Design an enzyme around this catalytic site. Structure first.
Site, short mmCIF file in Angstrom:
data_model
loop_
_atom_site.label_atom_id
_atom_site.label_comp_id
_atom_site.label_asym_id
_atom_site.label_seq_id
_atom_site.Cartn_x
_atom_site.Cartn_y
_atom_site.Cartn_z
N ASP A 142 1.02 -1.60 -0.11
CA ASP A 142 0.20 -0.10 -0.23
C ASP A 142 1.06 1.25 0.55
OD1 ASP A 142 -1.33 1.86 0.39
OD2 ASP A 142 -2.99 0.69 2.01
C1 LIG Z 1 -4.09 3.73 6.55
C2 LIG Z 1 -3.71 4.56 6.45
C3 LIG Z 1 -2.30 4.26 7.45
C4 LIG Z 1 -4.22 5.70 5.63
N1 LIG Z 1 -3.49 7.21 6.11
C5 LIG Z 1 -2.25 7.71 5.80
O1 LIG Z 1 -1.41 7.08 5.35
C6 LIG Z 1 -2.45 8.83 6.60
C7 LIG Z 1 -2.02 9.77 5.55
N2 LIG Z 1 -1.57 8.84 7.77
C8 LIG Z 1 -2.21 9.22 8.38
O2 LIG Z 1 -2.95 8.15 9.22
O3 LIG Z 1 -0.52 9.08 9.40
C9 LIG Z 1 -0.44 8.13 10.63
C10 LIG Z 1 0.83 8.01 11.74
C11 LIG Z 1 1.24 8.42 12.88
C12 LIG Z 1 2.21 8.85 12.91
C13 LIG Z 1 3.37 7.93 12.52
C14 LIG Z 1 3.09 7.36 11.23
C15 LIG Z 1 1.85 6.96 10.37
C16 LIG Z 1 -4.97 4.99 4.64
O4 LIG Z 1 -6.11 5.15 5.26
N3 LIG Z 1 -4.35 5.18 2.98
C17 LIG Z 1 -5.32 5.20 2.08
C18 LIG Z 1 -5.08 6.32 1.49
C19 LIG Z 1 -5.29 7.47 1.58
C20 LIG Z 1 -4.24 8.17 2.29
C21 LIG Z 1 -3.93 9.73 2.50
C22 LIG Z 1 -5.62 9.98 3.61
C23 LIG Z 1 -6.63 9.11 3.22
C24 LIG Z 1 -6.45 8.06 2.50
C25 LIG Z 1 -5.05 3.97 0.71
O5 LIG Z 1 -3.62 3.74 0.33
C26 LIG Z 1 -5.26 2.80 2.14
O6 LIG Z 1 -4.81 1.41 1.37
C27 LIG Z 1 -6.73 2.64 2.15
C28 LIG Z 1 -6.49 0.97 3.16
C29 LIG Z 1 -8.21 0.41 3.13
C30 LIG Z 1 -7.90 -0.56 2.19
C31 LIG Z 1 -9.01 -1.57 2.53
C32 LIG Z 1 -10.00 -1.00 2.75
C33 LIG Z 1 -10.40 0.18 3.52
C34 LIG Z 1 -8.81 0.61 3.58
N4 LIG Z 1 -7.33 2.09 1.15
C35 LIG Z 1 -8.18 2.82 0.92
O7 LIG Z 1 -9.12 3.90 2.01
C36 LIG Z 1 -9.26 2.54 -0.48
N5 LIG Z 1 -10.54 2.01 -0.05
C37 LIG Z 1 -10.81 1.10 -0.79
O8 LIG Z 1 -10.10 0.57 -1.73
C38 LIG Z 1 -11.95 -0.36 -0.44
C39 LIG Z 1 -11.21 -1.75 -0.74
N6 LIG Z 1 -12.70 -0.09 -1.23
C40 LIG Z 1 -13.42 0.15 -1.82
O9 LIG Z 1 -14.00 1.43 -0.80
O10 LIG Z 1 -14.40 0.07 -2.20
C41 LIG Z 1 -15.11 1.11 -3.15
C42 LIG Z 1 -15.63 1.06 -5.02
C43 LIG Z 1 -16.53 1.34 -5.52
C44 LIG Z 1 -18.07 1.41 -6.20
C45 LIG Z 1 -17.62 -0.16 -6.73
C46 LIG Z 1 -16.60 -1.15 -5.90
C47 LIG Z 1 -15.50 -0.47 -5.04
C48 LIG Z 1 -10.39 4.35 -0.47
C49 LIG Z 1 -9.43 5.16 -0.73
C50 LIG Z 1 -10.89 3.87 -1.91
#
Ligand SMILES: CC(C)[C@H](NC(=O)[C@H](C)NC(=O)OCc1ccccc1)C(=O)N[C@@H](Cc1ccccc1)[C@@H](O)[C@H](O)[C@H](Cc1ccccc1)NC(=O)[C@@H](NC(=O)[C@H](C)NC(=O)OCc1ccccc1)C(C)C
Ligand code: NA
EC number: 3.4.23.-
Lengths: 114, 114
Positions: free
Chosen positions: A22
């Site tokens: 990711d």
């Molecule tokens: C996992 C987090 C730590 C990450 N957040 C952060 O990196 C932030 C900026 N940082 C942060 O929080 O810092 C933490 C920290 C603190 C101290 C020290 C170190 C770190 C994040 O949410 N990252 C996401 C992108 C992002 C970046 C910045 C801000 C907000 C979002 C995706 O890459 C990450 O991969 C997620 C993980 C995930 C996977 C599966 C399920 C839930 C979550 N994917 C997603 O959120 C996506 N969802 C999906 O892919 C899901 C699986 N599918 C989905 O919803 O389907 C849509 C669909 C639509 C229509 C038909 C069929 C499907 C979303 C962007 C669309």
């Protein structure tokens, strides 16, 4: 049921974990029966909102060239573990979508001997 | 506001959009000034919860591999646009972790930036 590609399996605390690779995760995430937790937490911002999650204590993680000690976010709201930019930098990984599916290799194109 | 590496700027609907290249995003996301919206929506699961968001109407996206039409999720709760697996598959991108950052290259190894 595995996470989608790109994915990779690494040993964490002695046992394999299959992660979604990711590039959108600032730090790596575990989701289930994570082992001992720190008293420390982080604020995690996701696509839909934010709240705090606990840090694991340190874990031994087997990478391609050596073990490392690393901590993970424990995020039980996530559907699978996430291998983020923290560990992709240590692996010097390459992620390829130009082949069949998406594949993750090492710094010289090598399937990570991990 | 500006995303971390790996990132790429693409022309989308005639305007430059700078995306976080996000191998953890199933679909690509616009966050501000998305253009006209459809009334079709989708349930988005994020790392910390889930919410319903609307789809944009169709946009021309100028990929290095050739221009295509794509529709985006409008997720104003996200801090920057996300280029997900739906478009990384069309771009046949490679993402290379090197030094402290990460770079994006095309299917035939041409850098797409720097
Ligand atoms: C996992 C987090 C730590 C990450 N957040 C952060 O990196 C932030 C900026 N940082 C942060 O929080 O810092 C933490 C920290 C603190 C101290 C020290 C170190 C770190 C994040 O949410 N990252 C996401 C992108 C992002 C970046 C910045 C801000 C907000 C979002 C995706 O890459 C990450 O991969 C997620 C993980 C995930 C996977 C599966 C399920 C839930 C979550 N994917 C997603 O959120 C996506 N969802 C999906 O892919 C899901 C699986 N599918 C989905 O919803 O389907 C849509 C669909 C639509 C229509 C038909 C069929 C499907 C979303 C962007 C669309
Ligand atoms: Na592919």
């Amino acid at each position: 049921e595995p996470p989608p590609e790109p994915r990779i399996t690494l040993k964490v605390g002695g046992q394999p974990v299959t992660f979604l690779v990711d590039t959108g995760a600032q730090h790596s995430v575990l989701t289930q029966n994570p082992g001992p937790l720190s008293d420390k937490s982080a604020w995690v911002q996701g696509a839909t909102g934010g709240k705090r999650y606990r840090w694991t204590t340190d874990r031994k993680v087997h990478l391609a060239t050596g073990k490392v000690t690393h901590s993970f976010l424990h995020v039980p709201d996530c559907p699978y573990p996430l291998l983020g930019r923290d560990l992709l930098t240590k692996l010097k990984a390459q992620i390829h979508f130009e082949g069949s599916g998406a594949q993750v290799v090492g710094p010289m194109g090598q399937p990570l001997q991990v």
